[PDB]
């Protein structure tokens, strides 16, 4: 509640939120991702990935090419501020990151990088 | 155009887009597939195949079992909403299908069924 | 040199030889596999896998089902006499196996089990 | 028997002849190929392919690369004087060719172009 959000990615290619605001007074912020539904990771895998709005396209593009065994993320992608693993239905993953990595006024996007998902599974993140 | 999309599958085993939007005010939608590159068709052949997300795995698995002879598609597969032929380098093929075949509340995936290709060659199709 | 062979699998989905001879007077035989080219493992990965001709199809079918994370080989597959790891471009791997595992009168095939690859990446191994 | 020969290719990668002599008084010559054994075409396919000795390596190499659905022969290969289709166990095929295509004094080879078989399955053909 204070410094975390719980997010679900389902079999209908939806996150159950499209907007996050991180309280600047949190030292760290945590996203707890889960995957209701029944489809497997190779058909309906979801991650939660954070970048600047400007970097989203390249993160998604390079991620899609990286393949499932790399969680559809380019390894060591410096544009990725934080991310969960790619999960299938019934799996879960959390990611915690340092709030100092964000700056007020900058535009951030969160999204899933499974091929074709970012067009449907994305939202804004703000720091206040 | 308003009722079609151009898509490329290349010799890096990628499509050049992974998300398609079909405008519900179209009667029909056309996918124009092309194949930049130069590898033989029996090495890097591509098609564009559409099914629901729930059906994708079966279409791909049965498709590979069907062999090159059958363009890696199970003949008269009822799960396949639309598909192009399998093409090699420098070739083109288009498929047109009725938008009435889609519903606003369903999840669709497009993909190549050549063995192993769907690892990267897959994406979403959404009716809006 | 008398008890080993160097073999390459390339970006054209070919091995650079399709017939290997194993000298009966060798106690052990070594295959040194390399991968000229530049495609990544998840597009054009190769291994070198040995079975009887009669087991080849079953090994290839089950290997495909096993996934890239298993190097496209069924775990503990009793039909695989010997195998390298799966490698991408610029990588190499060797396997050594006891020549006593080969029997006179039997027919052997080597092949890559990456999806679709065995179509062209297959060959014979003969004990002399 | 004066203008034909029956040849078997078995599960042991052997033809049952290593040498053919075509009587030049024949207008045409026929090879009747059969495949004793149990193994199917995809792991133990055999064809009977005729070229000059000088052309054999290129025919075999390009044949390999062409795949099972092309009977492991390059389409319209001008170096191929005559060929059967590729057969598996229990199957049969015959080819007839004009004897005028052959020159007395020239060296010819017959062989199977299934990957790795030509090293084991080849012989000479002479016109007299
Ligand atoms: Cu997703
Ligand atoms: Cu493809
Ligand atoms: Cu391979
Ligand atoms: Cu053969």
Numbering used by the authors:
A (entry chain D), B (entry chain C), C (entry chain A), D (entry chain B): 1 to 128
Provide passages from the article that reported this PDB entry.
The asymmetric unit of spin labelled azurin T21R1 contains four independent monomers of azurin (I-IV) that are related by a two-fold NCS axis. Due to the crystal-packing environment in the triclinic crystals, the label is observed in two different but fully ordered states. Following initial refinement with omitted R1 side chain, models of the label could be unambiguously placed into the electron density in all four monomers, resulting in two distinct conformations of the label. In monomers I and III, the label is involved in vdW interactions with residues T126 and K128 of the same monomer and vdW interactions with residues A119 and L120 of a neighboring azurin monomer. Henceforth, the R1 conformation found in monomers I and III will be referred to as R1-I/III. In monomers II and IV, the R1 side chain lies at the heart of a crystal contact and is involved in numerous van-der-Waals (vdW) interactions and a hydrogen bond between the nitroxide oxygen and an ordered water molecule. For this R1 conformation (from here on referred to as R1-II/IV) PISA calculates a solvent accessible surface area of 260 Å2, 171 Å2 of which are buried. In monomers II and IV, the crystal-packing environment precludes the R1-I/III conformation due to steric constraints. Interestingly, the nearby K128 side chain rotates from the position found in monomers I and III by 180° to accommodate the R1-II/IV conformation. Comparison with the rotamer library reveals that χ2, χ4 and to a lesser extend χ5 of R1-II/IV adjust to values that are less favorable for the free label.
Since most proteins are diamagnetic, spin labels such as MTSSL are routinely attached to the surface of proteins via site-directed spin labelling techniques. Thus, the problem arises, that on the one hand, the PELDOR experiment delivers an accurate distance between the two spin centres, but on the other hand, the exact position of the distance vector with respect to the protein is unknown. We present here the high-resolution (1.5 Å) structure of azurin from Pseudomonas aeruginosa PAO1 spin labelled with MTSSL at position T21. Whereas one of the conformations fits to calculated rotamer libraries the second conformation does not, illustrating how the environment of the label can force it to adopt a conformation which is less favourable for the free label.
